[PDB]
Amino acid sequence: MQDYTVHIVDDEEPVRKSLAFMLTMNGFAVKMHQSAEAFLAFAPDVRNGVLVTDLRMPDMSGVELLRNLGDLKINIPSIVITGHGDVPMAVEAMKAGAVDFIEKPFEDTVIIEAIERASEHLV
């Protein structure tokens, strides 16, 4: 079995805990990052990790984080959680290289399947 870690970067405190705790209960290794900046600083140290973003403040959406990761010359399979009915965010996430986007609200089974799909991109 592959020992990978799901790295959750969520701006809204409560939502971050909700997703992380839910993944934790399903047996995933999970690490919560307090901010996009914190994750970027940690990114070069990531081995066998999948990234899940739920960034709402347009100051650094998941798309900008993906772009910044690209500049660091680091690739991490990423799922970008997008706003309910937000078409541009989803389109931009896929254009930026996300393995998939997930529009909110989502079922736990759906985000879990996306994360497993993204983990398949790890060597």
CA distances from 113 to 78, 97, 108 (A): 13, 18, 9
Domain count for the chain, please give it.
1
- To the question of whether residue 108 is assigned a binding role by annotation, the answer is no
- To the question of whether residue 54 is assigned a binding role by annotation, the answer is yes
- Name the token pair of 64: 């900008």
Resolution in A: 1.6
Residue among 12, 31, 11 nearest 20 (CA): 31
- To the question of whether residue 47 is assigned a binding role by annotation, the answer is no
Stated as kind and residue range, the H or E segment containing 40 is helix 36-42
Determination approach = X-ray
CATH number of the domain residue 18 falls in:
3.40.50.2300
Neighbours of 71 (CB within 10 A): 9
Domain that holds residue 48: 1-123
Q: Is 48 left (phi over 0), alpha (psi -120 to 50) or beta?
A: left
Q: What is the rounded distance in angstroms from the CA atom of residue 21 to the CA atom of residue 71?
A: 31
Identify residue 64 by its one-letter amino acid code: E
Q: Specify whether the CB–CB gap between 102 and 81 falls below 8 A.
A: yes
Stated as kind and residue range, the H or E segment containing 1 is none
- To the question of whether residue 71 is assigned a binding role by annotation, the answer is no
